[PDB]
């Protein structure tokens, strides 16, 4: 019903779009279809091109000097729109036909087909001293009136609309996570065991994650403390493959397990942005201009192993740690940690409308 339009600064060029969020169904992305309303009496033997660009901005091993944090272009597409010189008989979107009928004979359609294995819109949380465009993956539709593509893109006759590539939680739940550990301590038989396991494979934002930790320390060592953490990983293959990591939820429990005894408990954690608004580089969901978005959703890679091209791959894991105190030769402070990691999926369920209903002050 409703469409999005944005005219050029001088008003002699408008771009109409149906959606600003284009869902990726893994197999195929939704096509970025739309129309451009031009003024042939103003072009004066000049063409109109529409470009779609996926841009990656990040600094390779970011430090006090950010050298590589300028820009990158993971995908660029071009379409000549006003003069139908290619005579492209590609089928028109019903939205395109309706907009053409409404606008008249000067409205010409454009349509893109974003290839799969492309990054979703991910925003890296800026630091308190990070001045500039936020790092991450960003899509944009740009239409301009120029004689040729190589000509300078004048500011006045150009329209830049930001769009988002998004994913949603798959309708088929995965197997319930479960991990184990059996650490045989030095000079001690009957080793310690850990059997942490979640309850769901897929979680939604704002929902609690229940961890079913079951310890059985059949050894002669005492578990001093139990640390439970939810961490976010963000692989960034911009200049070199570099996996990052950041906890988002933590729950340090003081429960202790005596030697030759078991311990069963269920914990509960919920990642949210209120207590993480200061972790620089935290992967957030794609923003339009500056509004608040939740923690970034898990990246659903196509076919598991298709191609590792550049982009940010967001994943989440639950870490279950058992610290074991040790004295004697030590000073009762050298703790051996037994760790378990459980991967889970953090996505949005499939919606019925455009996500942005949030009231703005």
């Amino acid at each position, epitope marked *: 019903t*409703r469409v999005f339009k944005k005219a050029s600064p001088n008003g002699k060029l408008t771009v109409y779009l149906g959606k600003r969020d284009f869902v990726d169904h893994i197999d195929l992305v939704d096509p970025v279809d739309g129309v451009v309303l031009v003024d042939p009496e103003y072009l004066k033997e000049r063409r109109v091109y529409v470009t779609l660009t996926c841009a990656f901005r990040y600094g390779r091993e970011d430090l006090d000097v950010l050298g590589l944090t300028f820009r990158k272009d993971l995908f660029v597409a071009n379409v000549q729109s006003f003069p139908p010189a290619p005579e492209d008989k590609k089928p028109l979107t019903r939205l395109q036909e309706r907009l053409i009928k409404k606008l008249g004979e000067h409205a010409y359609p454009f349509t893109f087909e974003i290839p799969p294995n492309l990054p979703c819109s991910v925003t890296l949380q800026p630091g308190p001293e990070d001045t500039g465009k936020a790092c991450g993956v960003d899509y944009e539709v740009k239409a301009f009136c120029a004689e040729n593509l190589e000509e300078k893109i004048h500011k006045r006759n150009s329209v830049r609309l930001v769009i988002r590539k998004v994913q949603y939680a798959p309708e088929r739940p995965g197997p319930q996570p479960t991990a184990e550990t059996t650490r045989q301590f030095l000079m001690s038989d009957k080793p310690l065991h850990l059997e942490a396991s979640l309850d769901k494979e897929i979680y*939604y*934002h*704002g*929902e*609690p994650i229940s961890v079913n930790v079951h310890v059985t320390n059949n050894t002669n060592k005492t578990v001093k403390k139990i640390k439970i953490s939810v961490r976010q990983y963000a692989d960034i293959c911009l200049f070199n493959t570099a996996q990052y990591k950041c906890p988002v939820a933590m729950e340090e429990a003081d429960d202790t397990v005596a030697p030759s005894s078991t311990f069963c408990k269920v914990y509960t954690l*919920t990642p*949210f*942005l*209120a*207590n993480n*608004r200061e972790k620089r580089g935290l992967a957030l969901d794609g923003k339009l201009k500056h509004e*608040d978005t*939740n923690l970034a959703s898990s990246t659903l890679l196509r076919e598991g192993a298709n191609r590792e091209i550049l982009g940010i791959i967001v994943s989440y894991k639950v870490k279950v740690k058992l610290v074991v105190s040790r004295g004697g030769l030590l000073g009762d402070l050298a703790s051996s940690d037994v760790a378990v990691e459980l991967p889970f999926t953090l996505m*949005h369920p499939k*919606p*019925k*409308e455009e*996500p*942005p*209903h*949030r*009231e*703005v*002050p």
Partner: antibody, heavy 120, light 110 residues
Framework: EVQLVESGGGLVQPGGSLRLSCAAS????????IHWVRQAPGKGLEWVAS????????YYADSVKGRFTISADTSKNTAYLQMNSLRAEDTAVYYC?????????????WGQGTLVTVSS | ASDIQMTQSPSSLSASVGDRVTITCRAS??????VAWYQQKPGKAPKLLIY???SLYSGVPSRFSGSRSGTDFTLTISSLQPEDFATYYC?????????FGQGTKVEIKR
């Protein structure tokens, strides 16, 4: 089952204070927003306050901003509305309403409401 | 927007069982389609009818239907049943001061 239960609403004096408790059940404070909507006797609805609890927002009306404060207790899944400096124009039935945190702001769940009478 | 006023046109509405009635409201400025409709029986909490100015909330009878033309919004009831006697409210939620309408009382006429 989803239900919001109110408590702590009763007769007070013009200058007193109460603390309304909304025992939210069936959902979580992080995946939903909690709102306070009051209805004066014989009048229309008026939104008073709201708390996000995911982004850490608290919002207040232009008439209750200084005096009303909203908070949530995550462990007990209970939202709290501490009233202060209550005047005569605060006699109303206060409902705690729930909204989706992600991609909806429309109050699909309401409580029964607590009649808060503020008179000397 | 500093503050948005929702103006419900029918303050009082008299109808009969099986009749078709429409309740409309006009926003002060463009709230986009961020509009919801609520039904309140005497002595109870409001019930959400529709949202997004058209989307029919799950469980609501199909008689209720909303639409948006411009800055104005409309809630229509087709073949209203006797239990449609209530007060209907419109809400905008495009801005933090979410504003409600004054309400429309649909009374049964005879």
């Amino acid at each position: 089952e989803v239900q919001l239960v109110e408590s702590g609403g009763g007769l007070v004096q013009p200058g007193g204070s109460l603390r309304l408790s909304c025992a939210a059940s069936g959902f979580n404070v992080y995946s939903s927003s909690i709102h306070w909507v009051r209805q004066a006797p014989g009048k229309g609805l008026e939104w008073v306050a709201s708390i996000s609890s995911y982004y850490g927002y608290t919002y207040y009306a232009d008439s209750v901003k200084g005096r009303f404060t909203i908070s949530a207790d995550t462990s007990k899944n209970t939202a709290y509305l501490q009233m202060n400096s209550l005047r005569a124009e605060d006699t109303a039935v206060y409902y705690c309403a729930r909204s989706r945190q992600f991609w909806y702001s429309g109050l699909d769940y309401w409580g029964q409401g607590t009649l808060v009478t503020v008179s000397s | 927007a500093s503050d948005i006023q929702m103006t419900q046109s029918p303050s009082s509405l008299s109808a009969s069982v099986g009749d078709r009635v429409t309740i409309t409201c006009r926003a002060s400025q463009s709230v986009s389609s961020a509009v919801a409709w609520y039904q309140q029986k005497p002595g109870k909490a409001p019930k959400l009818l529709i949202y997004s100015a058209s989307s029919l909330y799950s469980g609501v009878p199909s008689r209720f239907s909303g639409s948006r033309s411009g800055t104005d919004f409309t809630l229509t009831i087709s073949s209203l049943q006797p239990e449609d006697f209530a007060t209907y409210y419109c809400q905008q939620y495009k801005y933090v001061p979410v504003t409600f309408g004054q309400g429309t009382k649909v009374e049964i006429k005879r």
